[PDB]
Ligand binder design. Sequence first.
Ligand code: J1V
Ligand code: J1V
Ligand code: J1V
Ligand code: ZN
Ligand code: ZN
Ligand code: ZN
Lengths: 519, 510, 520, 53
Amino acid sequence: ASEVPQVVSLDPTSIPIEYNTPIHDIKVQVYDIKGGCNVEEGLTIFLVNNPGKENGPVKISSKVNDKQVSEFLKDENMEKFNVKLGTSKHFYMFNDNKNSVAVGYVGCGSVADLSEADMKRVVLSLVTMLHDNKLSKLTVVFEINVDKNLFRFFLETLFYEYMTDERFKSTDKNVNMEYIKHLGVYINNADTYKEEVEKARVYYFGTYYASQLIAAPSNYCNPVSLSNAAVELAQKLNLEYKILGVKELEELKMGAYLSVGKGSMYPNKFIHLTYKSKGDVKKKIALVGKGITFDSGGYNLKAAPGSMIDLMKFDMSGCAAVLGCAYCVGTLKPENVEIHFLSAVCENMVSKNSYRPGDIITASNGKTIEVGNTDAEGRLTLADALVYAEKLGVDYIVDIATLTGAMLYSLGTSYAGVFGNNEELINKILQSSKTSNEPVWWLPIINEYRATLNSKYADINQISSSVKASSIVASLFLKEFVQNTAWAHIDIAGVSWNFKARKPKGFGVRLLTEFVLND
Amino acid sequence: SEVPQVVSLDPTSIPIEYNTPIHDIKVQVYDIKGGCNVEEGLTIFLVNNPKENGPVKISSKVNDKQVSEFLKDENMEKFNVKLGTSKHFYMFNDNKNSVAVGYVGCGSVADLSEADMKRVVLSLVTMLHDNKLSKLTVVFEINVDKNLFRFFLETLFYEYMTDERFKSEYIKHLGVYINNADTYKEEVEKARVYYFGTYYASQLIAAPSNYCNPVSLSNAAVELAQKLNLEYKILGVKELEELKMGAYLSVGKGSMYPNKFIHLTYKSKGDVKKKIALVGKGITFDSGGYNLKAAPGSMIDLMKFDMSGCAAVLGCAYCVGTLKPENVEIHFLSAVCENMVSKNSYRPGDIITASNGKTIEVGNTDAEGRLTLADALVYAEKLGVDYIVDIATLTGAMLYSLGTSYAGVFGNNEELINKILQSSKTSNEPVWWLPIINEYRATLNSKYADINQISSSVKASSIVASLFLKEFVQNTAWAHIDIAGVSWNFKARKPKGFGVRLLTEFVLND
Amino acid sequence: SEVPQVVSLDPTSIPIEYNTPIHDIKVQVYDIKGGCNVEEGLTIFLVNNPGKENGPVKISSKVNDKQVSEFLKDENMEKFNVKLGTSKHFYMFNDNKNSVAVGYVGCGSVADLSEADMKRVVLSLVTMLHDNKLSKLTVVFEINVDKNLFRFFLETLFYEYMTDERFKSTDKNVNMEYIKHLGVYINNADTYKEEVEKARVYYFGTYYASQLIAAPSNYCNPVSLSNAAVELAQKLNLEYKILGVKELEELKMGAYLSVGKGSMYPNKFIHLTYKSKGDVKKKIALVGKGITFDSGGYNLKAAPGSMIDLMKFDMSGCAAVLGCAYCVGTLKPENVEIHFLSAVCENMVSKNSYRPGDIITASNGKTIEVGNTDAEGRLTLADALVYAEKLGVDYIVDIATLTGAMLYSLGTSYAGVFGNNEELINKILQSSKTSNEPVWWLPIINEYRATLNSKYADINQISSSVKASSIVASLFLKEFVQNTAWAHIDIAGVSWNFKARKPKGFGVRLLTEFVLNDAL
Amino acid sequence: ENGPVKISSKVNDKQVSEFLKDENMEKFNVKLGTSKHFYMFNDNKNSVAVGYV
Ligand SMILES: O=C(N[C@@H](C(=O)NO)c1ccc(-c2cc(F)c(F)c(F)c2)cc1)C1CCCCC1
Ligand SMILES: O=C(N[C@@H](C(=O)NO)c1ccc(-c2cc(F)c(F)c(F)c2)cc1)C1CCCCC1
Ligand SMILES: O=C(N[C@@H](C(=O)NO)c1ccc(-c2cc(F)c(F)c(F)c2)cc1)C1CCCCC1
Ligand SMILES: [Zn+2]
Ligand SMILES: [Zn+2]
Ligand SMILES: [Zn+2]
């Protein structure tokens, strides 16, 4: 654990992390719909659709164990309301014991199978019923068909979107913030769904924890304080850990990673966490996250309109995802596997000591690199981290990184792109995407572009001079640093930040965790 | 129709070369087992080395003592196989005749990609352009499958030909030596057809916008159809008004050239088992309209290429009309017009009505391609086809997703998308499946019209354009090929004719 | 106190000229009803002709010399006209058979000259003083001016006549000679005599401020500026205190300190105080933005039209406040206590700089999400406003080169005033009138406040949707005054005189008149 | 600031009076633009909706 340097004594020296969230105090009970719904305190919400009838009428199908509430919810009363996706209504009535109860529904549309994006819309509607209403309990009645993973996704998303991060509030805390203490879920074949509840809560915190690191500003989350957070996390989970400092990085000849951090007041810190199963180890995996805690662009300063330099605390979203995965893996303790969680953390700054456009630098596999643009720094840090990962002797290397802005022009803000040198590995990532419900799309590494990286003087160019398809070119670059290991690369530059909600998504935690678990 | 002119010097047709020197080349395919005769012209050995950039070593037998001595291992070791490197020497053979002998390096990979093979071909063509020859002979000392072999022939033919129509010598024989020569001979004349559909596409694209305008391009298509005995129909403004194609007619309002909608049809002999509509975007010049292409890098001087999709569809008509596949019916459609700045032009913010009744709020007059394609798709679905495939230089964002080498395909039907991907493998024109992400559909929800033409927020323009196109296909398998990044060869300063061979392979493979 | 240096040639103080040539001018005022003596130097008549646009010149004064009276009779003067700013020179012999120079400056046809029209008159007069080695100037007022305008005439003449040669070395003007005598003839002279030395005080306060502004950033840095402020306090016998970093850390000025993090010069907070002898009825804090160079920080001023080479003037507000301190310390008003405040720092690019997106904590506990490092002035003012309110004053007025949007709203002639108190604003407008430094009241539009709602901090530094930056910046500053009448004077558009390529010293007389009128 | 909702007016319905009681409304707050409304049966068993802004 290292000392965080300060310019002034008001500079913070750690990231505030909330571990014991109000979500963790929520008692969750799952009941089978066949037993009928008890409708008592709190708010009871039916999730209802009308297959085929766009904006069709609401009909409540479940048995309700209360004559008054059953009468209130009969078809002719409900027919003036419709199932339009995201609609909701509140109901007030007295039950059979003369206690007032609150009931309502959320519309789930007319399509039988909700997509992840449809389900998020339903959850957002449900959460607006939880905000600005001091409730002790929520009950949710599923009158829609969801498989096990989509049930888990529903809960993860509910937990994530209900939580409000006030770590940086001081004079402006929400006076009225109270969370429910109890969550009831009514669903058919409840016994098959119960196993998803604790998994959902683990997936929620891994995602929320990565979100807390991303949203933390760069004066709080810097290379020293971020690697201290990873040490603390590993201590709580009994993970092995090792933080490499500059000396050790110099000895390992990590010249591409070290050159990116030369201009920072914070020394480079390379994070290496390990989880090993107690049994026989049948699979070794390295997960690599880009960890740039602030990206000014360097001397290729982000000054062009739309370059969004104020967002760039988010350039360690990949590291955050990998650490959030370490929380889920360390908590759920999968068997027969050894996972290495890696991040070459640094800060990309303008200074007399910064590396320069045109500098030629030597990565740890001895390849010389001509720097054509100091703002393409992530691929330099990953080059050395990929060489480190391969020396571990793993079966798979997966990296995740907010690498290229061109992703916003290719897949946009909803799907990450995955690239790789190995079709089997790529299919497993896509399978994890489908079970985690974090969407990813396979994109090609087009070999015809490789020659635009030929350098007149160094072994290779960092950037292309001619090719504008920069996500593919960056993948071509990274591929040069994996000699003989199956490797995939997930570019989350376009999906990491939720611009509408002004917050991170913690994207990738569930994806990488499903990837580890199903292996 | 008569092409309107501003002055009498204004051109009134697209010059086209149908009969090209390529068509005079006599092609002969020989087996390698017999050894190679080196009696005239230039003879090139395609050789690899599976040591990286290691030395050239010739394995074929040559029936000539002098050339054999030239090719002995001690000489050729002075040369290397780095991809595209070549040397050729002139010398006298056993009968005191002058012959040229050389090689092209094919690298160290056993399987050549389409990109590598293109690099091999370019080095060959460079020698062809610098030497007065009567004959070229190519000796395949590498392994290529039938499709890759035909691709080599098409690419050689296409790159060898020089388009001199706007300016103010070729070999007469091609010899090929290859293992299992008999299995390759049927590819030869198919390559010749594929070359010409591609070169004809490229002639239309390279033709500037004063020669190639909606009128003269629909006239060119008529002449093409007459030569191939295809049914043909050109819709004018009167008929387009009757069909209420307001999106398409709006784009052309500011042009001096009337809109012309092209419709050709190929009908197979025998039972028709599949009906396909191929839809090409045909903007003969895209200035941007009032959303003028004035921004750095918007490259207005390239926008004669905005009809590359139409040209690909007409080049496919040539190939289909010439090879005459069976059991298929194909419609070749294009809504041709020109996007100009005028007192009569459509404006940013106009609300127009498409031919299916959907109102569209225009957010940017430079997103004109999707407006013309919308009315073209409503026309096509009314034909009752099984498949609609449209091909278009639609969004500049392709340059930032897949780049200049691979085109993007989006669609509403996985089986149709998979047929396109399979056609990409056998045509060796590279395509990559990109998604239509439904979560972005809400960005097209106009406050006043039924739908917005563009998003004001989402930067994934190629996906948003596909979501817009998809709104104009109700109940038909549909796919959309965005060739905006891939159509123009910036290094060679010429069109690629991209998509002809892809679409023809799609038709022929059913 | 010690200015850090990179190399030994770096300057360690701001060159400041206190005893200017203006101060060596003997000024005499005579009543015009006694007649004008024309003996020597240049004698300029200020002449209008009401109604008749471009009307003929007529010299109404009595001239106590037969030869010059004859030269100036109406027949001779008829070929000249009074178009505002026009001027002519005459040469003749007086009764003593000495040659004299005489002339006039046209003041137009409107009998009431505006602030801007009188500037035009002075500039024409000054053209007659330049490139002419004269020992004496006489001005005859044949136009009507109240007392504040006669003062404004003199202040302006003094300011424009002076030439700042502190940074000239091999290109000093070898012909630079200043008059040693100024004579003024005006109706009811006795009532205008008191304005002369006031104008001289107001001239130097303005000129002192312009010296600090024009001084480049390698001379005028946070340490050398606070050093000069101390030296001014000592000369004026003002109380003074300079707060360094350790004391600012103790005061928890996290907003102010973050801006200066990237600089080689330690932050210095200037605190000067004037206190009347006897009863103190009004307590006032004047707060001046003092960024000695504004690079933009990591939001570097690199966009076309951002004029990074002008950004030595970003301490203009601090300079106005120090100039006002000179005037108040010199004129010594009664019944008031005045605090002269400036949070001085430099906004630089470095490994140590604050970053876009940092969340920082102001001295009032509020957390701030930095959205643009180039909106640094409102951060330093935030902590300075908190400091000022803890002093327990009746009024807080701040003056700052805050927003470039002022060029698009009021432009280069009028400053904008914003505030939370109607009475204070009217006092500023009233002082604007008697100082002749023009100011226009602009609203603080509360509907925009929501765009400063931050997702993670208590407040955003900037709006991401509102383009009305002068108003948004005012809404931000309001969050740092809890219960005190406060006004904010944005001088970003009016501070630099782009045509003459020099500072105006704007605000010194406005603030001094504000203090003086509240004392009376 | 952002204090609880409290309804002063008397309403001539027993069902809605109970819904509007202080103990129920204080779970809601008056932050500008925040609203809730609920469907219920009134004394005549007619469907009505009651809320606040
Ligand atoms: O894609 C690039 N750079 C990314 C970067 O700076 N990596 O360390 C980059 C990554 C994300 C963004 C970005 C992402 C967003 F989601 C966004 F909203 C935005 F405004 C910018 C922009 C650039 C390259 C392009 C080639 C030259 C170097 C910069
Ligand atoms: O993608 C767009 N426009 C394309 C167009 O004009 N369609 O009619 C467009 C298509 C191709 C290019 C383009 C392609 C190139 F290969 C190229 F080199 C180039 F400079 C531009 C640019 C824009 C939209 C993007 C949404 C808003 C309007 C402009
Ligand atoms: O108004 C702003 N910035 C001013 C500033 O940097 N304050 O410390 C700013 C102030 C003055 C100018 C300015 C003033 C001039 F008189 C001028 F000629 C000029 F070119 C710029 C430009 C910007 C904001 C604009 C939105 C948030 C980022 C900075
Ligand atoms: Zn970068
Ligand atoms: Zn266009
Ligand atoms: Zn600034």
